[PDB]
Scaffold this active site. Structure first.
Site, mmCIF file in Angstrom:
data_model
loop_
_atom_site.group_PDB
_atom_site.id
_atom_site.type_symbol
_atom_site.label_atom_id
_atom_site.label_comp_id
_atom_site.label_asym_id
_atom_site.label_seq_id
_atom_site.Cartn_x
_atom_site.Cartn_y
_atom_site.Cartn_z
ATOM 1 N N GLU A 449 -26.372 -41.516 17.655
ATOM 2 C CA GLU A 449 -27.492 -41.001 17.282
ATOM 3 C C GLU A 449 -27.711 -40.758 15.848
ATOM 4 O OE1 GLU A 449 -27.298 -37.731 20.213
ATOM 5 O OE2 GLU A 449 -28.993 -38.818 21.346
ATOM 6 N N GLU A 525 -24.740 -44.123 27.787
ATOM 7 C CA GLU A 525 -24.884 -42.692 28.389
ATOM 8 C C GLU A 525 -25.901 -42.762 29.524
ATOM 9 O OE1 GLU A 525 -25.810 -39.327 25.568
ATOM 10 O OE2 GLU A 525 -24.594 -40.473 24.172
HETATM 11 C C1 LIG Z 1 -32.562 -33.182 24.632
HETATM 12 C C2 LIG Z 1 -32.973 -34.449 24.157
HETATM 13 C C3 LIG Z 1 -34.096 -34.546 23.432
HETATM 14 S S1 LIG Z 1 -31.430 -35.212 23.031
HETATM 15 C C4 LIG Z 1 -30.267 -35.522 24.275
HETATM 16 O O1 LIG Z 1 -29.382 -34.136 24.417
HETATM 17 C C5 LIG Z 1 -28.571 -34.398 25.391
HETATM 18 C C6 LIG Z 1 -28.110 -33.083 25.837
HETATM 19 O O2 LIG Z 1 -27.005 -33.027 26.788
HETATM 20 C C7 LIG Z 1 -27.509 -35.476 25.033
HETATM 21 O O3 LIG Z 1 -26.985 -34.692 23.647
HETATM 22 C C8 LIG Z 1 -27.965 -36.734 24.503
HETATM 23 O O4 LIG Z 1 -27.287 -37.477 23.722
HETATM 24 C C9 LIG Z 1 -29.374 -36.420 23.691
HETATM 25 O O5 LIG Z 1 -30.063 -37.800 23.347
HETATM 26 MG MG LIG Z 2 -27.159 -35.956 19.622
#
Ligand SMILES: CC(C)S[C@@H]1O[C@H](CO)[C@H](O)[C@H](O)[C@H]1O
Ligand SMILES: [Mg+2]
Ligand SMILES: CC(C)S[C@@H]1O[C@H](CO)[C@H](O)[C@H](O)[C@H]1O
Ligand SMILES: CC(C)S[C@@H]1O[C@H](CO)[C@H](O)[C@H](O)[C@H]1O
Ligand SMILES: [Mg+2]
Ligand SMILES: [Mg+2]
Ligand SMILES: [Mg+2]
Ligand SMILES: [Mg+2]
Ligand code: NA
Ligand code: NA
Ligand code: NA
Ligand code: NA
Ligand code: NA
Ligand code: NA
Ligand code: NA
Ligand code: NA
Lengths: 1011, 204, 193
Positions: A449, A525
């Site tokens: 990210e 993921e």
């Molecule tokens: C909440 C989204 C806009 S971002 C989303 O949050 C998740 C929370 O578990 C993970 O961190 C993912 O990697 C992330 O893309």
């Molecule tokens: Mg993140």
């Protein structure tokens, strides 16, 4: 200098990175991996003092212990010691975004240690100190003199202390900054903590030493031959008499060895590396490494003199395996992988981010036991032991650079800026230099990210060039950029496209075939397991098995990042974002695991285990077809157990040894399975059992299972005309029905069964009423917040439509006496502000048999959001010990998450019917239930249910499980229908259409009786 | 336009260029050049530097430029002139017809080089026809080949002007000085003078 | 710090690179490429003194012209002024190969300039200085206060002097080192100046 506010300074005086060393001075010890007297640990009790900023540290500290300091264990995160609060933020940075500066109030941990150093270490050789993990930046002094500085909280920082130590007592002083410019590259969605949270050790090396070694294995076409190549570099004075010997061992046997003086081949017009040498060893029919069979050899690298005298020895475990992508598929030893992966953070509920061998083994065993074969290091290099365990227990690993800039706007603001190229570069290159020799690492990752910027293309290329043996992946910037060998999206759905601008998330099926696309697709993921989740899991597995280029994925994620807090009585409870006074915070978003923080599984774990099975089955007639999904092993530790039951009653069973080659099939003919003598559905259940114990499992472990309905004999034998006739008593406000010792009461003003008795014992605490809502799951809520409602989230739609507030208006309530029964008819309308949401029309028929048959027909306005459930509920007066049902079980199961559940007769303690999700919500449903028993009651039909001591009202109004309290009696929710729970993501609606309640008219029927 | 990176005297040549600790210093010599000159139409090709072997740092920087400025090819001769870090086969002093099969970094005949198995790029010598003193013998040989082979797209003579310096005699008469004339030692004597023109621009 | 012996430090406080700027405040002038009143040359006569190593440079130099300095033309190569010898080596480095270190005797050129800045320049906006080429590395002071450092002899090093100047007369001090860790990447076959 304020080095911690300058991306241009990531370290001062730090030694180069390299693979794990021990400087053994005995070859045998190297070979057997015994401890090394030349590698000492400094973990233990240290002195520690907290300060609000580096400017507040007293100079006296460099020279003498602070009387105000405390003694604490190291490794540790100081937030875990209560010095300051840990912070839970997901995307938003925990500091103002104003690179490369950090807050002036920058919590500083001053750690110090007084320790002994033996003169023998100082009189010759090099003494270095190694900090495997210090978060986020630090300065180091030794005996009051400054030594150096380092960044990157997730890789080791090593410094030469040779000239700073003295024989006897010495004192190290480490000034640790919580925030540094390195924090802009450390924005992973996890608790924000700090300190010396990885091991600290001292390593003694000879001045003439092995400074690096790289091991590679290449093979012939069918892997029956290999060549191991080990490049070794030295530091110190070159001498014609030096030599390096590399020898390879299979257990106690030395299978190959080579020796040569230093001097590599010609590289260019200036010559070659006079300080390196490469040994090449041939290996016939090597035993190959895979997660299925993690065969390992031991490579020992000896630096010595020509005459035979050892100077020092280094060594590593070697797994003979090839990783390559060919023709669009990711192959391991030439066979296409099916990644049953999971993302795993380094998290301990008491210890924060400190990892220990025990927890790691526990995690590995549970993973293997649940059919995972791969793990992604989300999103940083892990503690070194992790890799050793993966190599030996056998798991495929994605090793990932500690780089995530999620909170930037746009995301690649830093990654596309050349000024940040240096810092990112070391997070990538130092990781490779440290881990390149582990065979469990099969793919490198550029981080997570951080959008897609040119720095990523440059680093992608560096890796490609330095280590061609492993693909490189990276999801930022739309998951299919030029900086990735694998299309590796996060949360892309199976069939549904989410065409976001610039970075669309296409349906995975569709993605593979976009014009010109040829790469494999493995989600980095997917199946966000936050709370009551994993709905739709099977949908991914079915696609993975049907499309060759869909090669699986890494579930998000392994373990809930909840932390322990204690109440006034010292009783511990699980806390989440905000519970430490941290703000802003992201509340429960830190809890998305398949397992609770203490490693107890959530109900989704079994769904994962089942779908990730390595054996597939088909049933034709009396024949069971078993297909193996192993690529390398025969099923040499497996037997098929089969069982036939009629409505839960065992009728026949057996076992057959399994003998299937990898990717093969075996046909199993089941014995004549004689007709059951009774009405009911016959069901066939099969399970693969491992009769023998393994390094990661107990004898008897069940690895796979599947069920099928066989013959069914419908019940055509009418009653047994029986005797008593019920009697109806009418009053103005009620309808009472009496049958011997049983009475039932229908309130004429409300229209509901308001009371029931067995003898003089009332059975209800609350009238039986329809229910169209559920205490919202985390997937129902998404990112919706009171202070910031997301109107598209299911919970908001529901609230806005008045579903939670709707009032039942009675439209009809009549009573009729039949020949042998009494018939009550009701009709109600739920409305909200004038609009009619639902209409419930029922009949209750009570006979001489004491059974009350209920028929329910509901209408749902096409224009109101599809409701969470269509059922009835009530508060029963008693509390019984067990719950017994004939239906799907035994664990909690939902419409879109019930494949793992088996239809049979289950009986569990009441407590097991409640799932203690830390953020409470609707939980514990079991579906496909034909009969339910509790206390003296029995309900039959075809429904879904949950039973426990907490009302849906209480679940929805309570944010933490430790705050719930058992209510009086038992709350029973019995549903004709219940919406899916979703989970493709937990931030936008994810319940697929086939699992939403949109039919408009629904029918269900239940017989309630006592026995 | 060429980055200011040359590590010729290292042993081996790519000692620093293959070392990650040197990537940052290298990277700014490449990135800062592009940032400064990318708008000039006259610059048609970027170069990663000169005589610094072929290291992983070059591959990283090659890819950075390709990614940031796709409008211009990237070339680099180090490591054998046909590495993965070059869009053009750009040898220095490779001969027209004669191969010079040096180990590791051979200098094939330019006509033969184009057709090596699998080779497809154009070839433009980054340096050829070393004009040191009474030289340029065989110059026409190169032109004939460039005209006959489409993929032989020419080259850059080494070099334009003699690097001689003025010193003054006892008579204060200026004279042309070369390596060693300033007491500098060790020195490379007349090797600094390889141009088509004398220092004052008079033609050779 | 010895920043010139650390390839981890190639500049301190240096502004980002960009294409040629002139900050015209008139469109027609930008269109015709005419001189910009917002881009001034500081080329011309400066004060210069040679030292054998950085450690021999007096601190007084930061705030006051050294009486023994000479007035010389800039831009220039000091070897061309006879301060020390230009060296002609082709492949072999002019210094012992021992990265990232350089010799202790490292010829140091101490340049300075006293010049004027118009009030209008300091009443608003940003005033930076631009060194199009300093070989091989240098530290910069303005009015006695340290500003920054830079490497890469063949690209401009720019620094914001907005907070260091005053209207009227100001004094720049530039300490130029002949050898630095940047010399390891500067081994072209040409005179070493
Ligand atoms: C909440 C989204 C806009 S971002 C989303 O949050 C998740 C929370 O578990 C993970 O961190 C993912 O990697 C992330 O893309
Ligand atoms: Mg993140
Ligand atoms: C492990 C080796 C025997 S593979 C061996 O390598 C050779 C080059 O050395 C050729 O490529 C052969 O075709 C190949 O089988
Ligand atoms: C003399 C050779 C061994 S190296 C040869 O020296 C030349 C002298 O002008 C040029 O510098 C060339 O670029 C270089 O390759
Ligand atoms: Mg820094
Ligand atoms: Mg142990
Ligand atoms: Mg430097
Ligand atoms: Mg050269
Ligand atoms: Na597949
Ligand atoms: Na919040
Ligand atoms: Na999360
Ligand atoms: Na078996
Ligand atoms: Na709740
Ligand atoms: Na041509
Ligand atoms: Na000479
Ligand atoms: Na020359």
């Amino acid at each position: 200098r304020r080095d911690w506010e300058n991306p241009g300074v990531t370290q001062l005086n730090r030694l180069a990175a390299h693979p794990p060393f021990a400087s053994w001075r005995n070859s045998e010890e190297a070979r057997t991996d015994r401890p090394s007297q030349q590698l000492r640990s400094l973990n233990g009790e240290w002195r520690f003092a907290w300060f609000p900023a580096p400017e507040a540290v007293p100079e006296s500290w460099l020279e003498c212990d602070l009387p105000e300091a405390d003694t604490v264990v190291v490794p540790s995160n100081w937030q875990m010691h209560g010095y300051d609060a840990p912070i839970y933020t997901n995307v938003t940075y925990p500091i103002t975004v104003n690179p490369p500066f950090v807050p002036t109030e920058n919590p500083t941990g001053c750690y110090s240690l007084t320790f002994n150093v033996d003169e023998s270490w100082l009189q010759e050789g090099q003494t270095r100190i190694i900090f495997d993990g210090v978060n986020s930046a630090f300065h180091l002094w030794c005996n009051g003199r400054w030594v150096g500085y380092g960044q990157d909280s997730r890789l080791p920082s090593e410094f030469d202390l040779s000239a700073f130590l003295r024989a006897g007592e010495n004192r190290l002083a480490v000034m640790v900054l919580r925030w540094s410019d390195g924090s802009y590259l450390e924005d992973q969605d996890m608790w924000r903590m700090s300190g010396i949270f990885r091991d600290v050790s001292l390593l003694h090396k000879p001045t003439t030493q092995i400074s690096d070694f790289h091991v590679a294995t290449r093979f012939n076409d069918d892997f029956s031959r290999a060549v191991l190549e080990a490049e070794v570099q030295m530091c110190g004075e070159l001498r014609d008499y030096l030599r390096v010997t590399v020898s390879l061992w299979q257990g106690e046997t030395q299978v190959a060895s080579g020796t040569a003086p230093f001097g590599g081949e010609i590289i260019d017009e200036r010559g070659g590396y006079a300080d390196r040498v490469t040994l090449r060893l041939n290996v016939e029919n090597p035993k190959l490494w895979s997660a299925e069979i993690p065969n390992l050899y031991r490579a020992v690298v000896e630096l010595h003199t020509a005459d035979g005298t050892l100077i020092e020895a280094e060594a590593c475990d070697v797994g003979f395996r090839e990783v390559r992508i060919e023709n669009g598929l990711l192959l391991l030893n030439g066979k296409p992988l099916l990644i049953r992966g999971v993302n795993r953070h380094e998290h301990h509920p008491l210890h924060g981010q400190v990892m220990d061998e025990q927890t790691m083994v526990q995690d590995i065993l549970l993973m293997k036991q649940n059919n995972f074969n791969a793990v992604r290091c989300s999103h940083y290099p892990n503690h070194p032991l992790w890799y050793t365990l993966c190599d030996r227990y056998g798991l495929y690993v994605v090793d990932e650079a500690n780089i995530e800039t999620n909170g930037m706007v746009p995301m690649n603001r830093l990654t596309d800026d050349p000024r940040w190229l240096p810092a990112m570069s070391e997070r990538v290159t130092r990781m490779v230099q440290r881990d390149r020799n582990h065979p469990s690492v099969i793919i490198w990752s550029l981080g997570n990210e951080s959008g897609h910027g040119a720095n990523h293309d440059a680093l992608y290329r560096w890796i490609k060039s330095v280590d061609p043996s492993r693909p490189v992946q990276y999801e930022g910037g739309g998951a299919d950029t030029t900086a990735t060998d694998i299309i590796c999206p996060m949360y892309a759905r199976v069939d549904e496209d989410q065409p976001f601008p610039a970075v669309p998330k296409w349906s995975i099926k569709k993605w593979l075939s976009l014009p010109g696309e040829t790469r494999p697709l493995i989600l980095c993921e997917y199946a966000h397991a936050m709370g009551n989740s994993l709905g739709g899991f099977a949908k991914y597995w079915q696609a993975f098995r049907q499309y060759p280029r869909l090669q699986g994925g890494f579930v998000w994620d392994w373990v809930d990042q909840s932390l322990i807090k204690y109440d006034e009585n010292g009783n511990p409870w699980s806390a989440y974002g905000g519970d430490f006074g941290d703000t802003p915070n992201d509340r429960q978003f830190c809890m998305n695991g398949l397992v609770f923080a203490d490693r107890t599984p959530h109900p989704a774990l079994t769904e994962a285990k089942h779908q990730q099975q390595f054996f597939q089955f088909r049933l034709s007639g009396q024949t069971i077809e078993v297909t193996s999904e192993y690529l390398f092993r025969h099923s040499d530790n497996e037997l098929l157990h089969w069982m036939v039951a009629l409505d839960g009653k065992p009728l026949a069973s057996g076992e057959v040894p399994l003998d299937v080659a990898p990717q093969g099939k075996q046909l199993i003919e089941l014995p004549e399975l004689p007709q059951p003598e009774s009405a009911g559905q016959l069901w066939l259940t099969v399970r693969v059992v491992q009769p023998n114990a393994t390094a990661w499992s107990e004898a008897g472990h069940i690895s796979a299972w599947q069920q099928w309905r066989l013959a069914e004999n419908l019940s055509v034998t009418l009653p047994a005309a029986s005797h008593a006739i019920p009697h109806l008593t009418t009053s103005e406000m009620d309808f009472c029905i009496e049958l011997g010792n049983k009475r039932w009461q229908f309130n004429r003003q409300s229209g509901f069964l308001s009371q029931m008795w067995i003898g003089d014992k009332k059975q209800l605490l609350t009238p039986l009423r329809d229910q169209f809502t559920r205490a919202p799951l985390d997937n129902d809520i998404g990112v919706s917040e009171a202070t910031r409602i997301d109107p598209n989230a299911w919970v908001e739609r529901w609230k806005a439509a008045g579903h939670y507030q709707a009032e039942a208006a009675l439209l009809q309530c009549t009573a009729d006496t039949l020949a042998d029964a009494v018939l009550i008819t009701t009709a109600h309308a739920w409305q909200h502000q004038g609009k009619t949401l639902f209409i419930s029309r029922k009949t209750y028929r009570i006979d001489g048999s004491g059974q009350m048959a209920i028929t329910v027909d509901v209408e749902v306005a096409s224009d109101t959001p599809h409701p969470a459930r269509i059922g009835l509920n009530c508060q029963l007066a008693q509390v019984a010990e067990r719950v017994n049902w004939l239906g799907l079980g035994p664990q909690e199961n939902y419409p879109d998450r019930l494949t793992a559940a088996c239809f049979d007769r289950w009986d569990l303690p009441l407590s097991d019917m409640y799932t203690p999700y830390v953020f409470p919500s609707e939980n514990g449903l079991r579906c496909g239930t034909r009969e339910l028993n509790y206390g003296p009651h029995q309900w039959r039909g075809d429904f879904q249910f949950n039973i426990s001591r907490y009302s849906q009202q209480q679940l929805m109004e309570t944010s933490h499980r430790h705050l719930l309290h058992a209510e009086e009696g038992t709350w029973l929710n019995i549903d004709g229908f219940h919406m899916g729970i979703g989970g493709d993501d937990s931030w936008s609606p994810s319940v697929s259409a086939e699992f939403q309640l949109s039919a408009g008219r629904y029918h269900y029927q239940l017989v309630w009786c006592q026995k």
